[PDB]
Amino acid sequence: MPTPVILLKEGTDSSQGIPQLVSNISACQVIAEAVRTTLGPRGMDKLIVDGRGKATISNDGATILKLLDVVHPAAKTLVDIAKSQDAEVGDGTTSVTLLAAEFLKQVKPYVEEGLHPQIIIRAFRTATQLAVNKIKEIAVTVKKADKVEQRKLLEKCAMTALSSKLISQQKAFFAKMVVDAVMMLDDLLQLKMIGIKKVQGGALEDSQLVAGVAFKKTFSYAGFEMQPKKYHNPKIALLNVELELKAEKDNAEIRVHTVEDYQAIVDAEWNILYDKLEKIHHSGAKVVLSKLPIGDVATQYFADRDMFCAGRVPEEDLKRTMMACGGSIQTSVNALSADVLGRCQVFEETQIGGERYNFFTGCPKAKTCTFILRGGAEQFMEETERSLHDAIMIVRRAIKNDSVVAGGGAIEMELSKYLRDYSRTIPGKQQLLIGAYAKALEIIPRQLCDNAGFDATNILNKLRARHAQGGTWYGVDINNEDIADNFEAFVWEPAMVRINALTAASEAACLIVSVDETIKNP
Amino acid sequence: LSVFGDRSTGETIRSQNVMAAASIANIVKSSLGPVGLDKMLVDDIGDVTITNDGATILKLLEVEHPAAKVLCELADLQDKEVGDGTTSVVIIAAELLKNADELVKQKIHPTSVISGYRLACKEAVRYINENLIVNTDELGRDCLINAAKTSMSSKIIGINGDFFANMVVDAVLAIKYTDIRGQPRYPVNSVNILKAHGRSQMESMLISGYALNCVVGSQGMPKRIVNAKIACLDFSLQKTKMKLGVQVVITDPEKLDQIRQRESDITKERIQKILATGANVILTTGGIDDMCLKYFVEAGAMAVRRVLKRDLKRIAKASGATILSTLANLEGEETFEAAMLGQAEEVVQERICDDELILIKNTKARTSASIILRGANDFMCDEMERSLHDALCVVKRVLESKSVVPGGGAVEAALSIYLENYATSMGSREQLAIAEFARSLLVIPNTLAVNAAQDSTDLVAKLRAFHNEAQVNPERKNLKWIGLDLSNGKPRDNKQAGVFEPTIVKVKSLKFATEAAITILRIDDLIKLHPE
Amino acid sequence: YGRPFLIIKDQDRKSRLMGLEALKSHIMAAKAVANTMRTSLGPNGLDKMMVDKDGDVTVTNDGATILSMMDVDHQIAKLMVELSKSQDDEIGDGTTGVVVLAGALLEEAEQLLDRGIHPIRIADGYEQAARVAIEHLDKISDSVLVDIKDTEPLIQTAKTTLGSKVVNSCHRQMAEIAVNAVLTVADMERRDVDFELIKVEGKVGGRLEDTKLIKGVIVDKDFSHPQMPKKVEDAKIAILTCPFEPPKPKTKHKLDVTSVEDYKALQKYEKEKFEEMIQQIKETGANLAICQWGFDDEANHLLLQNNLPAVRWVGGPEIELIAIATGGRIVPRFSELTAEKLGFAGLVQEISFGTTKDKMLVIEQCKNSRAVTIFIRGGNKMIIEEAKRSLHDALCVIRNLIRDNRVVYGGGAAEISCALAVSQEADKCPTLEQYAMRAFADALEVIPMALSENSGMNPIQTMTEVRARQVKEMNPALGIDCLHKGTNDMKQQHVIETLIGKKQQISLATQMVRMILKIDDIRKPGE
């Protein structure tokens, strides 16, 4: 009994052609709807809980898409774009996804026509290149101008980017903190320096910016409460080496005939630890931190001689501290000298919400700070942290590039007008694709107004009419519920965000539309 | 808060309805236009059914989602009213729904869209009646052939379209009928269609008369009669019952034999009364007993049993015979009159595909038309009879309404731009609905091109360009034209090409599509109930 | 075209509620939490009893505990639980009503949503209202900064905050206990106090009134050797961590005795070292010793031989409490032990507290001690735990008062005046935020209503009279006569509360509910 021989595995799914492509477009639209509501000064956030039961709320779309583990292949590309934009420029990852989906949405009716996708993607590439050039032309610098403080642009940039996430009504506050903080980051510019500290409890209006380093951590040994916990003008000693009785040092068997020699051996071990402690004290410092655990006895000696100590401190915060007080971490206690000894304006350790924290700050030459982030919700901790991370990284980009553009979708409207006018010049099939490009691009204000509950058709129509002639930076104003020169209203976003957004969306459309069929393997 | 099922609201259910409508559209999107490719259904058990006529597909396709059922019923109604456009009307409905939703999918208030749609339909039908072409000046048989063979493409028989159109027009002109005293109404389905696998449609023959799917009752009884003595008889032929309850009780046995004797002699005398008239042909839906058969053989007449009622009614209408449910008179005595007889030149049973069917040729009272199909399998034969039924339907429409429309999508070709211009008049928001109506209605050329597999955007653009030119320089006697083709993949003049469609097709199509859009668009929530 | 496709795995069971329906569901859940909590507010309030997963029981009034022990599944219930935990371990009681504020506010918020107001504006208005409320509140604040040494404004405050817990039986006494403890352990120069210095300790048995603060440390061990004297008058104290054993360097080590004389020398050393350490401790001049770890029995005796009672197997924290209480140090060897590091106290005496159970150790140190302990006694384990939690909250509130020395008379008058100020601003509100203002005021109005409801009075007759009085007069010192005394002057009634308490409460609740409004869409995976 012979049988026909199969080509591929049993159940190898296949689906080819226009139905496959339109299915992909619909899937992208579905992904969009999961995020459509999100962006807006009156925008939105989602709550997603995992199978493990841990809740997670988010307003940044990229985080949400990470949580929405997508199985369908095409949408995985969109979620990857979300990761890309998140690593690049920040909010508008939301906007990025909406642009991608809407590009696909406008193209799909023409895909119903049997157009070879490559024509579509060629038009897309040309349009995107032209759009990027237009943005760069209408980019705005300030250091040419006169009425800019080197921070005012940064402050307003934070102002704009923030006012969609969970802390929107404290923007006038958080912008000042984040700008002043990032001003200290120079010139390493990397996020690892400034940690974020999710202290439980408290109203986030009470969240603290310290020109120094703090710990949410400690660990109880014998005397840790005994030693004084104020040090007005202290010297910081930083030990990586542990302080304990050969606890985890080199493993060795020892042999001793004379009992007195055995006595001498135990004495010599304790003399090792005493020698280390004497080196520490005679150093003249009073504060000692250690990655590795601290012997209780050494704690006792610090207590007796009024030195403060702590053990098991997480390494990242230790690096923060050493970069703060200027001292260098040490592993050899013997080679110690005053040069590697960090100094701080004042040291403390004060209760916040039941937790035992440590403080030292006021170091005039400290290029790294930290956020004590009060808040009554554990979920606020992650959400506020995400928002703050977006703020920090976007303001870093802004410092790097003195280029700003108006917000409120006005950029998108300007691009729409420019591209539509350009479309008249090129005859043939390209014209319709350019038109669809503009019609998809205009989506951003529409979603804004919809989440604002307005007649975005009146808004859009007035927008186009006024924006044909009257000024570049007119766009949606949420509170006045109509057009405004958002630029003067200080809705200021770095150009890089929108530029990268458009580029990513363009190549996303290229990728998706450049697919005809799909093969699945069990 | 309802048990046994959840509910869905707003955007979810809107998108679901559009999704279903698009599904139904794509089910038939490949069977329209002179390059349409027919569908076929492995049923569940092998009794397949090839067909491209959309309404047939929808009826034979089980459907569960509500809106899809709505569209299916719309297709069925359209078939009950036109015959084709089930090629088209479903697509029109789905596309209008799609674009209307796309407007609504943004925010746009549905009732505004509905009002815009209503205006669109009224404007469109008015513009069509300003776009009409009258056939009265045109040669009758000419335009009839044109409309026929236009419908004949997109079907199995489009190739033989010329021959088939000739046959169809001959039949329909032969089935003339004087209506309400002022109308020359032509009855569809009056022409009889019989399928017979075997020879090709090349050899499929038109019958100048009527044809029976019946057989001679008695093999000894003759086969052909050159005389017209045709009597109809609903009244069945059995040695009669007592027919209600009449028990027969015997107290004098001497008479049982005579009782049984007349139990048949009653039928015997009825038959003899029938035959003494000289009728040589009898038909009967009711049963025919061997008693009658042998009598007929001895008389040499013609007898047929178990004929369908509609067929014998048509026989009476053709031969001029009178349907007779029984024998009776204004006086009680059961008699029969030669005046009841109908006539036809010759009646023959003939063997087509080793099955004997009965033919009736040239009834003198009223000319009748029947058509025999010849083909390879039963699949091709019954799908082509569906096609022919649509043919007769459209020709009936043409005759009933002396008015024709240029085929090949000139309709929406004009309509899109005309409605585009008219949209700005309203000034409200509804002109957006108007424009979307036009753009969606532009779907027909798109589907045409894709099924013809050429650059659809370019053909559509050229069409729109020609029509827009037809809306510039109002001296349009040399600037108004009409047309679109596929076989050469470029525009033409369908008026010259003969590609015509009946007006009522597009008119009723657009009206029903508008109603369907209004119904489905007003939806904003389904509530499910798991059964009892 | 039409066909199902996979977007998210388990696509069948990934449910989703979106928009206004979701919001209303969330408000229903929050209101359910609010109703569960309402009865626990106020001295007339009634507390809850929880059943642990492992079948354990617990009776309590502290809302933080109420939600902590709860096994909720709906997410926003978890959010409220975490709310209460945060509020408590920031402040103390008030969780007695914080979630109540949350629930009433969200209820009235739903009232607004029914009129189709977009949630974001609601959030913004509620934030504005909260700012107005807190600024009016701290305008109308009284202060205890101008107070003399704060003996019984603190006593009054404790009296208030304990009006809610069942320990109210002798709550005067526990009020003095709390205030004395915190005043002893407070660092006025810093405005803080670490509760690690406070040793909470409840041993079941005896009356509730028997509960007594001990200016000292109480240790859950008896004497190392039973024969040692039970009382000691002098308290020369030694604090050691090296066990009374032959020292062993914890590097992997062991000797290699070979000869007769080798073993004999080792044998001699065995007792020689014990004699050495005994001589060391004696010559130190100490009288009593405490060791972190176990003893070798032989040294146990020899220690007995020299009239030096000691304690074995003392856990760390207890040890350092001993050290700080006695002013002594922690010595790691005998050799480095000297008289100066020795701890001193007034009286140390073992107590056979239990009628038939093992004993306890108390150190009635008599000089100043930056540490202190509270010893709680009573008839129920559950009552013991409840006393623990209650007294802990009392300590927290007095600590908070140390952080800020300005308070507000309680009894609901405060937020009553806050609501009136909010209403007054609502007239200069203009547009739609006006509804937000009056909305927040009416929602905030709940706490007096709940108090009166638990008081059994007609709530609203009472609260209307309260509003009328606080309008006609200017005193924001008129709440609800919770304990049925004909004066609504809680200032005379002394029903008082920290500014920080209500301020943090209302701000935190505002932020929490602001987020609650901030959400629209939920995707729950089916279990």
Method: cryo-EM
Inside any domain, residue C11: no
Q: Is A164 annotated as a binding residue?
A: yes
Task: Please provide the DSSP assignment of B256-313 as one string.
Answer: HHHHHHHHHHHHHHHHHHHHHTT--EEEESS-B-HHHHHHHHHHT-EEEES--HHHHH
Q: Is the same domain home to C222 and C351?
A: yes
Query: B26 vs C21: CB contact, 8 Å cut-off?
Result: no
**C263 and C352: one domain?**
yes
- Out of A93, A160, A361, A368, the active site residue is A93
Interface partners of chain C (CB pairs < 8 Å, 3 or more) are A, B
Instruction: Report which of B39, B54, B60 is spatially closest to residue B91, judged by C-alpha positions.
Output: B54
Q: Do C92 and C152 belong to one domain?
A: no
Domain boundary, last residue among C405, C425, C458? C405
Residue type, C382: M
| Contact list, A446 vs chain B (CB under 8 Å) | 106
Q: Strand pairing of A404-406 and A492-494?
A: antiparallel
Q: Which helix (H) or strand (E) holds B404?
A: strand B404-406
Distance CA(C21)–CA(C196), nearest Å, equals: 48
Taking the mean position of all CA atoms in its chain, how far away is CA A91? 9
Beta bridge partners of B286: none
Distance between CA atoms of residues B97 and B21, nearest Å:
8
Is C502 labelled as part of a ligand binding site?
Answer: yes
Tell me how far apart the 2 most distant CA atoms of chain C are, in Å: 103
User: Could you tell me if A166 lies within 8 Å of chain C, comparing CB atoms?
Assistant: yes
Confirm or deny that B150 is annotated as ligand binding: no
The tokens of A453 are what?
A: 């509950």
Nearest chain B Cα to C1, which residue? B23
Give me the domain span that covers residue C150: 144-215+371-405
- Asked if the peptide bond before residue A187 counts as cis, ω within 30 degrees of 0, the response is yes
Range of the domain at A368: 210-399
A contact test, residue of C11, C16, C75 with most A CBs within 10 A? C75
Same domain, C220 and C359: yes
Mapping DSSP to helix (H, G, I), strand (E, B) and coil, where does residue C199 land? strand
Q: What phi, psi does A16 have (nearest 5°)?
A: -115, 140
Residues C371 and C394: their CA atoms lie apart, in Å, by 17
Residue C151 among known ligand-binding residues: no
Give me the CATH topology for the region B206-400. GroEL (3.50.7)
A partners (3+ CB pairs within 8 A) are: B, C
Q: What is the DSSP string of A333-364?
A: STT--GGG-EE-SEEE--EETTEE-EEEE--S
Q: Which residue, among C44, C104, C10, has the nearest Cα to C483 in the 3D structure?
A: C44
Indicate the number of domains in chain C.
3
- C515 with C459, same domain: the answer is yes
Q: Kindly state whether residue C187 falls inside one of the protein's structural domains.
A: yes
C463 in the same domain as C451: yes
B424 given a catalytic annotation: no
How far is Cα A268 from Cα A278, in angstroms, rounded to an integer? 14
Chain B residues interacting with chain A (CB cutoff of 8 angstroms)? 11, 26, 106-108, 429, 432, 446, 449-450, 453, 455-458, 460
Chain A's closest residue to C117, CA to CA, is: A453
Q: Is C294 annotated as a binding residue?
A: no
Edge-to-edge, what's the strand order for the sheet holding C198-202?
A: C198-202, C372-376, C212-214
Residue C52 lies in a domain: yes
Phi, psi dihedrals of residue B315, rounded to the nearest 5°: -60, -45
Q: Which residues of B touch A456 (CB under 8 A)?
A: 106-107
Amino acid at B273: K
User: B457, A110: Cβ pair inside 8 Å?
Assistant: yes
* In a domain? residue C358: yes
Burial class of residue C220, CB neighbours in 10 A (0-12, 13-18, 19+): middle
Q: Which one is catalytic: A38, A77, A94, A384?
A: A94
Q: Which CATH number fits the domain that encloses residue A383?
A: 3.50.7.10
Which DSSP letter does residue B474 get? Answer: S
User: Domain holding C481: CATH number?
Assistant: 1.10.560.10
Assigned domain for C5 exists = no
HEC profile of B199-241: CCHHHCCEECEEEECCCCCCCCCCCEECCCCEEECCCCECCCC
Tell me: do C148 and C175 sit in the same domain: yes
Pairing of strands B302-305, B281-284: parallel
Task: Check whether residue C295 and residue C229 sit in a common domain.
Answer: yes
- Within a 10 A sphere around the Cβ of B445, how many other Cβ atoms? 26
Burial status of residue B8 (CB atoms within 10 A of its CB: 0-12, 13-18, 19 or more):
middle
Whole-angstrom distance, CA of residue C503 vs CA of residue B406: 80
Boundary residue ending a domain (C379, C405, C431): C405
- Same domain? For C161 and C59 the reply is no
CA distance B114 to B459: 31
CA-wise closest residue to A407 among A160, A50, A189:
A160
Residue type, C353: F
Q: Are B456 and B430 contacting, i.e. CB atoms less than 8 angstroms apart?
A: no
C154-193 core/surface letters (b: 16 or more CB in 10 A; e: else):
bbbbbbbbbbbbbbeeebebbbbbbbbbbbbbbeeeeebb
Looking at beta carbons, which residues of chain B come within 8 Å of C19? 10
**Which residue from C minimizes the CA distance to A17?**
C1
Say if CB A362 and CB A212 are below 8 A apart: yes
Closest by Cα among B366, B361, B367, B357 to B345: B361
Any chains having at least 3 CB pairs less than 8 A from chain B are A, C
CATH number at residue C378: 3.30.260.10
Distance from CA of A378 to the nearest CA of B (A): 33
- Which chain A residues touch B if contact means CB-CB below 8 Å? 19, 33, 110, 112-115, 429, 432, 446, 450, 455-457
Compare CB distances from C90 to A45, A201, A380 and report the shortest one's residue: A201
Residue linked to tokens 């585009």: B420
Chain B residues with CB-CB distance to A429 below 8 A: 457-458
Q: From chain B, pick out residues whose CB is under 8 angstroms from the CB of A457.
A: 106-108, 429, 432
Whether C7 is covered by a domain: the verdict is no
CB–CB contact B429 A457 (8 Å): yes
Q: Which two tokens stand for residue C362?
A: 């108390």
Rounded distance, CA C452 to CA C464, Å?
12
State the Cα–Cα distance between residues B343 and B352, nearest whole angstrom.
24
Q: B138: which 2 tokens?
A: 């045109």
CA atoms within 13 A of residue C509's CA, in its CB half-sphere:
28
What CA–CA distances, in Å, run from B118 to A343, B86, B125, C126? 82, 22, 11, 46
**Coil/strand/helix, residue C156:** helix
Q: Does C319 sit within 8 Å of A222, measured CB to CB?
A: yes
Considering the domain boundaries, does residue C8 fall inside one? Answer: no
Say if residue C427 is in the same domain as residue C297.
no
Assess whether C250 and C157 both reside in one domain.
no
Q: Are A210 and A365 within 8 A, CB to CB?
A: no
Edge to edge, the sheet with strand C288-291 lists C237-240, C288-291, C310-311
Among all residues of chain C, which has the CA nearest to that of B27?
C1
Phi, psi of B296 (to 5 degrees): -65, -40
Residues C259 and C343 in one domain: yes
The SS3 call for residue B176 is: coil
